[PDB]
Automatic annotation (TrEMBL):
Belongs to the glycosyl hydrolase 5 (cellulase A) family. Has endoglucanase activity on substrates containing beta-1,4 glycosidic bonds, like in carboxymethylcellulose (CMC), hydroxyethylcellulose (HEC) and beta-glucan. Involved in the degradation of complex natural cellulosic substrates. It is an enzyme of class 3 (hydrolase). InterPro entries: GH, Glyco_hydro_5. Its EC number is 3.2.1.4. This is cellulase. Keywords: Glycosidase, Hydrolase, Signal. The gene is eg1. Residues 10-275 form the Glycoside hydrolase family domain. It comes from Thermoascus aurantiacus. GO terms for molecular function: cellulase activity. It holds the Pfam family Cellulase. It catalyses: Endohydrolysis of (1->4)-beta-D-glucosidic linkages in cellulose, lichenin and cereal beta-D-glucans. GO terms for biological process: glucan catabolic process. Disulfide bonds join 212-249.
Length: 305
């Protein structure tokens, strides 16, 4: 059986070409392929994270009406995942920013989240992710935006679903404890907050190089966060991680996941970055049937499924 509550992949593409807003489906961005998601489910993956742009889903003002056509594809993608019994993570992949300006109004953000959650309120397999990778912004604001999201979600009657909260510092696991301590004060009447951290293995933790620092760097970089979660009685997820298809990265990945598997009292699982249809020869592609991580990394993930 499965080692973790959740183990799966990001399904990237709806957030592509972000300099073009709204942009054009099939030209600037694309939604995930349900057929290749099905393949990942057959391999044992049970969670799929779906990035999208806030501005494409709710144009101009985040308190306004959704765009019906982009919403239609978000719904279709999400419900196709959940119809197969997998969890679907709704990820406004926005960096704490809307038209590249910091989201400074928790109340506006709460209305955005009631709008979004109302589209999925009765689906217990949807997971709401408040925002991808807050960074370079006020730490109390980040707390308040996460809380506003939770409040908006629950106000819509979407009470069955987990909520993935994200911290500042690009929600990095390695930087969590001295940046994001205040995030322990988030509240949820459903008691379904998961602290989503991201952890890359290259020098600067940006996940842009296929080269990992060392064969133990993953374990090393999530150790402090693991202790923080335990000390605070919280649960976490690694919502993005990756490494190159090479020996040092594969060893680091195994080491990190084996470490997590020893600490399942706090770690709910892990989500690879990334599958999706427009990655080609991308160093981290988990897209069946020919992504490099699909072919060379999935065999080292299978032990957890």
């Amino acid at each position: 059986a499965k080692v973790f509550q959740w183990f799966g992949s990001n399904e990237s593409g709806a957030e592509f070409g972000s300099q073009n807003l709204p942009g054009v489906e099939g030209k600037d961005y694309i939604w995930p392929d349900p057929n290749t998601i099905d393949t990942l489910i057959s391999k044992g993956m049970n969670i799929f994270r779906v990035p999208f742009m806030m501005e494409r889903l709710v144009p101009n003002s985040m308190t306004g009406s959704p765009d019906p056509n982009y919403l239609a594809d978000l719904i279709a993608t999400v419900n196709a995942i959940t119809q197969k019994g997998a969890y679907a993570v709704v990820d406004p992949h926005n960096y704490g920013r809307y038209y590249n300006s910091i989201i400074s109004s928790p109340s506006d953000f709460e209305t955005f989240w009631k709008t979004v959650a109302s589209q999925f309120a009765s689906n217990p397999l949807v997971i709401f992710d408040t925002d991808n990778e807050y960074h370079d912004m006020d730490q109390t604001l980040v707390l308040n935006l996460n809380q506003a999201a939770i409040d908006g979600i629950r106000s819509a009657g979407a009470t069955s679903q987990y909520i993935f909260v994200e911290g500042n510092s690009w929600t990095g696991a390695w930087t969590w404890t001295n940046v994001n301590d205040n995030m322990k004060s988030l509240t949820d009447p459903s008691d379904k907050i998961i602290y989503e951290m991201h952890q890359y293995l290259d020098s600067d933790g940006s996940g842009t190089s296929a080269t990992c620092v060392s064969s133990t760097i993953g374990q090393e970089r999530i150790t402090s966060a693991t202790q923080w979660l335990r000390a605070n009685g919280k649960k976490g997820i690694i919502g993005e991680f990756a490494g190159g298809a090479d020996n040092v990265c594969e060893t680091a990945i195994t080491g990190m996941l084996d470490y997590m598997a020893q600490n399942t009292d706090v770690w709910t699982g892990a989500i690879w970055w990334a599958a999706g249809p427009w990655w080609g020869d991308y160093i981290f592609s988990m897209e069946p049937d020919n992504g490099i991580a699909y072919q060379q990394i999935l065999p080292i993930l299978t032990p957890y499924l």
